[PDB]
Amino acid sequence: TTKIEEFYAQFGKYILLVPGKFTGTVAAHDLSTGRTLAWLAGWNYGDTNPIMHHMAAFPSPDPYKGFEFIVNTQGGKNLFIYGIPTTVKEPGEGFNIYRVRYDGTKFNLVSNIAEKTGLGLGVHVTATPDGKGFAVADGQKDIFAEFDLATESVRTAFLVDWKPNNSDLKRAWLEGGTMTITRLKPTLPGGKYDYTGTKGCKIDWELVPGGELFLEEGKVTGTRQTNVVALDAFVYDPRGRWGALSARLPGVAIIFDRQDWEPVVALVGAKGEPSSLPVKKVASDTWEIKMDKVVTPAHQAGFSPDGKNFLFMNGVRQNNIMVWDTSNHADPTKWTKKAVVEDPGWRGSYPNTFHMVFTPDGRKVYVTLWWPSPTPNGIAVVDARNWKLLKSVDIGPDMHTLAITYDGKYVVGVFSGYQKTASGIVIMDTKSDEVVGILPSVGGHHDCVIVPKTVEDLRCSRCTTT
Amino acid sequence: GHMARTTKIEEFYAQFGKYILLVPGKFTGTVAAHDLSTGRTLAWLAGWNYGDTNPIMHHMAAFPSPDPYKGFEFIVNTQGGKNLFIYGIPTTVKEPGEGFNIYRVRYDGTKFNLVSNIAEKTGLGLGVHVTATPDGKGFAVADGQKDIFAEFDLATESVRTAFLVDWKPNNSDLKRAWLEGGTMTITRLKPTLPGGKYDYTGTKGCKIDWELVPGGELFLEEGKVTGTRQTNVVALDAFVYDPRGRWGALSARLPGVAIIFDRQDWEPVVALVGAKGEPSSLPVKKVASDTWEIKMDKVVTPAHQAGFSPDGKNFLFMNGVRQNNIMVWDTSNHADPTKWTKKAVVEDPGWRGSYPNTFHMVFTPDGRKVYVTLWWPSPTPNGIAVVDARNWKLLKSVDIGPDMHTLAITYDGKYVVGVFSGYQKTASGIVIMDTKSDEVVGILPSVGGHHDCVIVPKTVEDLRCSRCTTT
Ligand SMILES: [Cu+2]
Ligand SMILES: [Cu+2]
Ligand SMILES: [Cu+2]
Ligand SMILES: [Cu+2]
Ligand SMILES: [Cu+2]
Ligand SMILES: [Cu+2]
Ligand SMILES: [Cu+2]
């Protein structure tokens, strides 16, 4: 009685790429036809714990003829935090970083960059603004690195450590501390690092949403629980030069100079706290940030497409979107808080505002509203000129990432069932801010991307935000 | 004028009614349920999460539920061993997991629950078709590497019967081991281990080291399938049920025979011969208390998919490769399958090559039409044939996509729902066809290599057009 063609025809020619989390897959879907173009199952290749996690795709002149992406995995006890009644005793170690190419017919597993480099990193993956490199961060090890794609080599790698003022676990962040940033050097032959698999972990799983409190309360296992900062992402200024490394537990975004590979300033999320704190060089490869207190954790971080705003979402002890004026491209020490988005319905840990995407023209930003079961999860629409919440829309359980078609017309998001219940791909019209439909999805996806054609597209992809 | 307005998908889903599609993923390792009324995936499960290191999720059947949205149960099985290595995936795995699990899964209105591993309990690791019995209280599983099938009781998770089928070729040369005929021996198995357990877990019992893939029946002749008992394979496939009760048909791909069994006194009763130009059937002779034989002077062609019509008065068997057709028997005599006789054969000039193979099927509830997939190797688009199931004539053929597999039907008869599977590496999807117009209404995305699909039934009448009567 009704055909789907008009539904798909409205989108134009865009490919959605998704990781599957506990499914172990990655897949590309053609939004113009409904077909899944290709998929890959990590366990087929001998990855015995393929928790396919985060990803970024590089610009392709014609995605339908080919494209490339990076996808990483988690492992270890990350298998055990979603309530699945598995009897597995010894999970695979994970922390793989895979380069995958679509060739117009199928996916090709090109390389395991974690094995090649020795850096096993399991949290966000971001493409550089020129599309020629990528970063990966890890919040169990508190390491991040930027990689060159062509040579599959490490450009830089850093370790971040917390030395708490108060050694009591419940007070280890509230009462402040010193954050130390160390540029790593490889320790193994052939310029390799020694961080494969679970090696380097301070805690046994990535902190969950609101999970700072669970860490404080003694509910997260690991060997260095009071030294974690929970690095999350290295997001890029679309204008070049700078990246921002988010550290969830201290609620700080450390700005790095990608030319000199040095941290230059530390933005402090919390409302009522300074815009930033200085970074002091204490040795050739070591810098420190000193905090008298940590008012609140923070998570989502990123830049508007023009690079003139930077956002950091406070959570847990405050629940707001902090905005800095980053218009001065020359000097990040001058970046200053300019606005804060609040709502009477945003308090505490939930909603956890842990993904976003801007419209290409910068006028709006869409923000995930995540909650534990059974509260409906959804999407907030924020006015990114006046910095005010416009609307919230309920979607389903366990809402994750938001991408946008590069013409700015449709937001495409994923929800993931807490790895056990309802999941899907949701599409929202950006003019009406209404959901136009849900498509089925066998996936627990905590990421999604639309394959870009240009470097300009990356300004609204997995580059500037997560 | 091509982008004048926004379209919502609601009207598309609203047309289908309240039906849940269940799919296994083959190399994805998943099973999933999709709500055709909303587009949401209700739940999924990934076998590797539970420690199954080679979860090649193959076939499945669901049992009737008074309200599928509140809960339902199904069986899904897996393959194992070197089956990981036969779809061109460039894996470096040296020692694949043993697999051959049979899982009972319950949806509870929110999530899937892995209830039991029936293979571990019973000792029968069987990796090919799963079929529900017509009463919805038992199920069968067959395997085409081991050439064993069994019927199981759902409530007790126990084996009602198990049989081994073996080929003794007239000509010992692999190339001619089937063409020049042989003897098929059917043996009722008895368990050999404590607790009434069989000794067929994992890869144990395999005659060949991997399955005969879709379209690949003749690969064994050519020396492209390794194994220890290559010339003794029959490649059992499915045990499909007569909806009127009592009888089941066991498909044996390489001899091209469907062996009819009496489920009430577990014995084979007649062998239907697929090939066009060959007799309707051959006798089954009892040669010991637990042993029967069928003698064949020749095997003209292999066959694969099989099924009864909803009224049980027709039986279909799809000859492949050496002949591609739909062979039809008059099974109207429910008292005596030895009287079942060939009545029609569906052929087409376009089916004269090695491919397409006439493949999986689904009947309309009213029996008026049968939909039959048309399978080809890459790169030819695979499709769906629409057949008049009263006069046995091809009505239409439609192209869909690469590697087309199974078809289900909504139980009101209005929509066929099928899956295509990319040869485990390229395009995949769920396709929906309106049975009034015989037109595809749309494709939905699907991360899956599915060789099966079912719509969750509400009643035993629904099973007449589900994974019970046909493959
Ligand atoms: Cu994050
Ligand atoms: Cu997420
Ligand atoms: Cu995640
Ligand atoms: Cu137009
Ligand atoms: Cu079959
Ligand atoms: Cu099939
Ligand atoms: Cu199959």
Give the Å distance between the CA of A400 and the centre of ligand 2.
3
Q: How many CB pairs under 8 A join A and B?
A: 201
Q: What is the rounded distance in angstroms from the CA atom of residue A193 to the CA atom of residue A184? A: 9
Q: What is the rounded distance in angstroms from the CA atom of residue B377 to the CA atom of residue B397? A: 17
Spell out which residues have Cβ within 5 A of ligand 5, the ion: B 237, 471
Q: What is the rounded distance in angstroms from the CA atom of residue A25 to the CA atom of residue A45? A: 11
Give contacts of B108 with chain A, Cβ < 8 Å: none
CB atoms within 10 A of CB A349: 19
Q: What is the rounded distance in angstroms from the CA atom of residue A415 to the CA atom of residue A377? A: 9
Contact A326, A334 (CB under 8 A): no
Q: What is the rounded distance in angstroms from the CA atom of residue B324 to the CA atom of residue B346? A: 9
Please give the span between the terminal C-alpha atoms of chain A, in angstroms, as a whole number. 40
Q: What is the rounded distance in angstroms from the CA atom of residue A82 to the CA atom of residue A339? A: 36
Which chain A residue lies closest to B9 (C-alpha atoms)?
Answer: A437
The closest CB to that of A438, out of B3, B40, B112, belongs to B40
For residue B462, the surrounding DSSP H or E stretch is: helix B460-463
For residue B183, the surrounding DSSP H or E stretch is: strand B182-188
Give contacts of B448 with chain A, Cβ < 8 Å: 36, 39, 442
Question: So where are chain B's domains?
Answer: 10-463
Does the beta-carbon distance from B9 to A438 stay under 8 Å? yes
Give just the sign of the alpha carbon dihedral A252, A253, A258, A259: negative
Token code pair at residue B387: 């057949």
Q: What is the rounded distance in angstroms from the CA atom of residue B233 to the CA atom of residue B295? A: 15
Cα torsion A345, A346, A350, A356 to 10°: value is 120
SS3 A171: helix
Spell out which residues have Cβ within 5 A of ligand 7, the ion: B 451
Q: Which residues of B114-148 are buried (b: 16+ CB within 10 A; e: fewer)?
A: beebbbebbbbbbbbbbbbbbebebbbbbbbbbbb
Residue B305 counted as an annotated binding residue: yes
Q: Which of B127, B74, B15, B146 is nearest to B410 (CA)?
A: B15
Residue B450 counted as an annotated binding residue: no
Contact A457, A346 (CB under 8 A): no
Q: Biggest alpha carbon distance in chain B?
A: 76
Q: What is the rounded distance in angstroms from the CA atom of residue B148 to the CA atom of residue B215? A: 21
β strands within B63-144, DSSP E: 72-79, 102-107, 112-117, 130-132, 138-143
The closest CB to that of A4, out of B6, B12, B448, belongs to B12
Distance from CA of A457 to the nearest CA of B (A): 21
Which resolution, in Å, applies to this structure? Answer: 1.0
Give just the sign of the alpha carbon dihedral A357, A359, A365, A368: negative
Token code pair at residue A433: 């801010």
The label of the residue with tokens 């500037």 reads: A464
Token code pair at residue B445: 């995305």
Ligand with minimal distance to B56 CA: 7
Please give the span between the terminal C-alpha atoms of chain B, in angstroms, as a whole number. 45
Give contacts of B430 with chain A, Cβ < 8 Å: 440
Q: Is A84 left (phi over 0), alpha (psi -120 to 50) or beta?
A: beta
CATH code, B10-463: 2.130.10.10
CB atoms within 10 A of CB A443: 31
State the number of CA atoms in the 13 A half-sphere of B464 facing the CB. 22
Cα torsion A271, A274, A276, A282 to 10°: value is -130
Backbone breaks in chain B after residues (C–N over 2.5 Å): none
Does the beta-carbon distance from B447 to A88 stay under 8 Å? no
In eight-state DSSP terms, residue A88 is -
Q: Is B62 left (phi over 0), alpha (psi -120 to 50) or beta?
A: beta
Give the angle subtended at the CA of B463 by the CAs of B460 and B468, to the nearest 5°. Answer: 125
Does the beta-carbon distance from B50 to A424 stay under 8 Å? no
Q: What is the CA radius of gyration of chain B?
A: 21
Contact A162, A248 (CB under 8 A): no
Token code pair at residue A125: 């993956």
Token code pair at residue A79: 């298998």
The label of the residue with tokens 């609307």 reads: A391
Pick among A3, A18, A35 to test the B interface (most B CBs inside 10 A): A35
Cis check for the bond before B66: say yes or no (omega within 30 of 0). no
Give the Å distance between the CA of B237 and the centre of ligand 5.
5
Contact B235, B216 (CB under 8 A): no
Give contacts of B444 with chain A, Cβ < 8 Å: 4, 34, 439-440
Does the beta-carbon distance from B443 to A35 stay under 8 Å? yes
Contact A146, A135 (CB under 8 A): yes
Give the angle subtended at the CA of B337 by the CAs of B334 and B342, to the nearest 5°. Answer: 105
CATH superfamily of A5-458: YVTN repeat-like/Quinoprotein amine dehydrogenase (2.130.10.10)
Q: What is the rounded distance in angstroms from the CA atom of residue B141 to the CA atom of residue B132? A: 9
CB atoms within 10 A of CB B198: 22
Structure-determination technique: X-ray
Please list, in sequence order, all residues whose beta carbon lies within 8 angstroms of the beta carbon of residue B150, skipping any fewer than 6 positions away: B122, B124, B126, B140, B141, B159, B160, B161, B162, B163
Give the Å distance between the CA of A29 and the centre of ligand 4.
24
Spell out which residues have Cβ within 5 A of ligand 2, the ion: A 400, 446
Does the beta-carbon distance from A420 to B110 stay under 8 Å? yes
Beta bridge partners of B131: B140
For residue A177, the surrounding DSSP H or E stretch is: strand A177-183
SS3 B374: strand
Which chain B residue lies closest to A422 (C-alpha atoms)?
Answer: B42
Please list, in sequence order, all residues whose beta carbon lies within 8 angstroms of the beta carbon of residue A145, skipping any fewer than 6 positions away: A117, A119, A121, A135, A136, A154, A155, A156, A157, A158
Alpha-helical runs (H) found in A304-420: none
Which chain B residue lies closest to A82 (C-alpha atoms)?
Answer: B49
The sheet with strand B303-308 has its strands ordered as B303-308, B314-319, B325-330, B341-346
Please list, in sequence order, all residues whose beta carbon lies within 8 angstroms of the beta carbon of residue A330, skipping any fewer than 6 positions away: none
